[PDB]
Design a protein around this ligand. Sequence first.
Ligand SMILES: [Zn+2]
Ligand SMILES: [Zn+2]
Lengths: 373, 373
Amino acid sequence: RPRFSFSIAAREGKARTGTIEMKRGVIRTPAFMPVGTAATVKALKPETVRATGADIILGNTYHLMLRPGAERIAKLGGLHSFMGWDRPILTDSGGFQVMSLSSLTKQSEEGVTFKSHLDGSRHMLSPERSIEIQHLLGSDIVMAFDEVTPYPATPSRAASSMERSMRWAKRSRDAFDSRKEQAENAALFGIQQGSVFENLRQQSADALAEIGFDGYAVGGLAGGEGQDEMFRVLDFSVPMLPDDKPHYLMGVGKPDDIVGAVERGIDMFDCVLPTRSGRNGQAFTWDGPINIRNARFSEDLKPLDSECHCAVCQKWSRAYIHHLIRAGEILGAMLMTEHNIAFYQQLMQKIRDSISEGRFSQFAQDFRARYFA
Amino acid sequence: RPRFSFSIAAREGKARTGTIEMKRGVIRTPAFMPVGTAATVKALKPETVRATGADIILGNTYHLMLRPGAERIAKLGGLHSFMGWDRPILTDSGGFQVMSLSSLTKQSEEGVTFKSHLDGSRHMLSPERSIEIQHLLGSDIVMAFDEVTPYPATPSRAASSMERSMRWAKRSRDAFDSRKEQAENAALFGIQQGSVFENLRQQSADALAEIGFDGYAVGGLAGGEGQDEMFRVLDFSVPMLPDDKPHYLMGVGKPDDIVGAVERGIDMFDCVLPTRSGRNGQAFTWDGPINIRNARFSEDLKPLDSECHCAVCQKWSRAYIHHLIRAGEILGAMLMTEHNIAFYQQLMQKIRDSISEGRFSQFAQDFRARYFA
Ligand SMILES: [Zn+2]
Ligand SMILES: [Zn+2]
């Protein structure tokens, strides 16, 4: 396999289905990436993550650099070896979480210094250091280090952040390219910014395409704007990106969001929703989500979802899982997470098959009628 | 397979190895039973419990009756169906936990009434109700309902409790026998009491043998007396029990305790140690236990134990598991528990093979030299 090759096998409207071939494996697109926070997809062995259909997982740079440490993971042989997942890993740049989880940020053109939300330790993150950490982890898909624009943002501030992000995207590119081993074996994605503003999204897309990346993420969304606005922004933003490279919508999302975003040209997704909500009691079904803690499930012998092919739905009842989650049992988190992640993979499979067969628009319509019945 | 058949295949001194055949499967003895509290062996799917080598698990009656409820489990098809373990299950009588976990106990000759440590609900437990609950769960090995003698106990109080326990053992026997379906498909074990006193242990054994049970537990030990005293009591107590039936030491225990107790004629064991300590950071090894949270393991690439055949030791390093447990990750509990339970099953296998080969005494000596090196 090559370092990176994205091939589009079928299209329907703006939707695409295909494959990304990398050294560690093939990624089927549109793709959902389960999120591994501190080097684990929560409550799942990697073999179980793979069994659900995942082709690639996401690792959080910010969390890994704080614990167990980027250098330490490198010494121990890299993230893949450390956690036991041998397929591709995408790492985020660590920037988003600095804003959302650290204390005392000091921000500047060089990068950001911050205090750990764990200990009192002070850490630094810049385009160069972010790229270095991702190398130390041995990431397959490296994200450029950007400055995240909170929602809502004024046009002036959105512009300033976007412009800084574009300067940092060049720095990221150069850092990545300067490290022979990373340049030869990993891929680099740039992140489009500009908040909800069309002209800024355009300037950002143009800047990113001028530098040149293996893939392009749409950043700054799912920040509180709501689905209507998100979709409106995707409408004009995705077409600005090079059509022949993957389009990654960071941090999205709910099943309905994924469907609409694929309709708009998105090829890759990640979210903590299926894992996080899993441990919380929310199970996804084709008829909409359920909260398994609800008393109405205490004696329901049906599986979580009536069609789901996952091992949880083959083996255990809603009643049992209701019991486990109410009791705060670890097996409850294990089973809910496996089911939710498998649901997401089944959704992605249905999306890929429908596009390949030229009936994705019908699938979207059928999916919505039932999910929101 | 028959309802119950215990066969002894080999002996060495007081040690025995053999099999208990029951309708739901064969139990190899000496046996270790992982403990399922609220209908789950904590952090493990039943298939994983089986994969470690477990032939039978233990379920806690007290916890099951409070949540999700004995009647409810019956309605849903019984404990096996509910939790997805189709092999034998031994249920305790629920008495021990009433003493240790409930509030406001009212005790009498009829039984005990108590308040849930969960809600404010008031529950009752008597020989008859304990046997009924175990039937509703669909237990394969039913324990007689006894009164537990705290350590230390005066001879007078030990005697009074033992005598009451023997009256309750007859009541348990009669209750079990009166329910055709339970009598025909399950087995009933009596519990010897009498604290540390030889004459009381003798009276108790004589009373139990007169009633007649499928197996005999040594109760009242591991209550704070220490290994020396426990062993001293086992020395005279086990021989009092019918030699041709299984001998069950309830609530034991550490690996060294298991070895010494088998040397003294014990065939069955349960303890929360490998599960509980697992989540706590303690991993069993042939060279003694380790606490994986210790900083010395942060970059140790070796498996938890150098000889262990479990899936955890095949796949992950001490360094990774150290990280998971420090981080409070669910996968940390999953991996530690699987390893610890598999260690216990490997110990039991080595014990069975050594007895079968007439070299158990040497195995005990070799085990101790290394474990306590
Ligand atoms: Zn499922
Ligand atoms: Zn092991």
